[PDB]
Structure formats: structure tokens, C-alpha cells
Design a protein around this nucleic acid. Sequence first.
RNA 1: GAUGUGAGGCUUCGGCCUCACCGCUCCAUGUGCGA
Length: 221
Amino acid sequence: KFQYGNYCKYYGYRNPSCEDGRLRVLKPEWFRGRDVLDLGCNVGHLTLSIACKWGPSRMVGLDIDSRLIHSARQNIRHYLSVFPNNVVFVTGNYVLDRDDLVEAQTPEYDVVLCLSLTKWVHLNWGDEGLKRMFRRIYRHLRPGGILVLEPQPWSSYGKRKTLTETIYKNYYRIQLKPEQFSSYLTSPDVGFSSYELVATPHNTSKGFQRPVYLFHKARSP
RNA sequence: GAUGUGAGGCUUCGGCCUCACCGCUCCAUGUGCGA
Ligand SMILES: Nc1ncnc2c1ncn2[C@@H]1O[C@H](CSCC[C@H](N)C(=O)O)[C@@H](O)[C@H]1O
């Protein structure tokens, strides 16, 4: 059971080809020379694809599962500050325990990637945990920064609801649905000033054809 | 990625309801690891 979406063979079935269709949708100019945080990086195949070809000055992959982070560090050699010096991995839970911790975050990134993560944060920590993540992302971005959001649809949550009693409990308490993420992220509770639907990448499975959004943090104060 | 069967009833023929049955799991999946 992978109650956080912490699958240890994830890319083997997401990208059987080994070609991640999201790389045709993400734009190189978003990353080149920028500080990037990759949330829920798993074993880091996508993290390392970006770090080794699109030259971010700093790329940080974060995952709650230390086993996947160790794997990600061992995957660096498959992609051989220029890469590999521009990438680091960290084990951690991005969802913060208190709203006081979430509003003390200082800006450090030009880009935050939040790809295929919202469902797992939502199921494990409820609306409250998802909103803490959203507010923390905004606080962690510099003016002019961007959030790249790839959220799972609500229709795909239900088949995971029995993983744990807490997940089950959260499933039936959730009131902020994916269809309302955009409005929430651009409300004063978070503060993103505009957003765009970039595209829906192609994938062998329709279940992985998810919209990719760009949320902009305004350059002016 | 994958929810089957039957009787009765209501259908706005799109299905739905009650009950009975069958299940409550199977399949896909490693660029990590080598006691
Ligand atoms: N609260 C949390 N903090 C950090 N990582 C988390 C998390 N909740 C779930 N995760 C991690 O999120 C990952 C989702 S797999 C998604 C991988 C990657 N973002 C991609 O799109 O290809 C899992 O590896 C899981 O361990």
C-alpha cells in the first residue's frame, strides 16, 4: 500500500515508453537559470530530465518518502552550476502542521512544480492540508514566480479512499474540489494574480492526461 | 486498468429502485537495492 502515492515503480507504468509527454508541454524558458522546487519528486525522473537539459541554476526535489529520495540520488548517474551540481534531493513533508508555520515561509524559488501531488495531499491531510500547501507555495515564490500545477480530477480519488481510515475520513470531508483549485489559488487566501491552462500532455493512458496550469505571482508588490 | 449475474417493479427507454446472488479483489508497474 502506497498511501501517499509513493509508488516505488511509478514511472514504469506512467511512462512505459520512457518518454514523459509533459516535457513537450513544460517550457524550457520557465526553468533556465531559475531556482526550482519540485514537490513530490518521487524517484526524480522528471526532476532530473529538467535539471540536466534545461539548465536551472538550482533544482530541489522534495519527497515525503526517504526510500524514493535515495533512489532519486542513485538515478542522477543515468542523466550524465552545470548538471549534476544544480540538483539536490530532500526528504520531507511539505504540508505544515500549523497555519503559523505556513505564513512564515520566505521566498526562495522562481518556479514550484506541483505535479500529480494534490490528490495525495488532499486525501492524507484534507482540505486544510491542501490549502496549507497552496499557501506555502505562494509564500515560497519570489515576485514574478510561477506555480506549475498538474492536479488529478476528483473522479480519480474514490478508488483510493479505503487505503487508510484517515484517508477515508478525509475523502468524505473534502469540500474544496479540483474544479475550485484555480479560484482558490487566485483568491486573497493565496494570492496568485493570474493563471493559464498550458495544455493537456499526451500519455498512453487517458488516466494520466491531466491539465497543466501555470499560476503567476505578480512582479509588483 | 478492471464491477459481473438473476427476479420483480418503475421507466421520460438514459436507466433507475427493491431484493436476491457474485465479490469485497485481481491486473499493470524499478532508471532503487544485491544479505
Ligand atoms: N506531503 C507530501 N510532501 C512531500 N511529498 C509528498 C507528500 N505527499 C505525497 N508526496 C509524494 O508525492 C509523490 C507523488 S508521485 C508524483 C511524482 C512527480 N511529481 C511527477 O509528476 O512525476 C509521491 O512520491 C509521494 O511520496
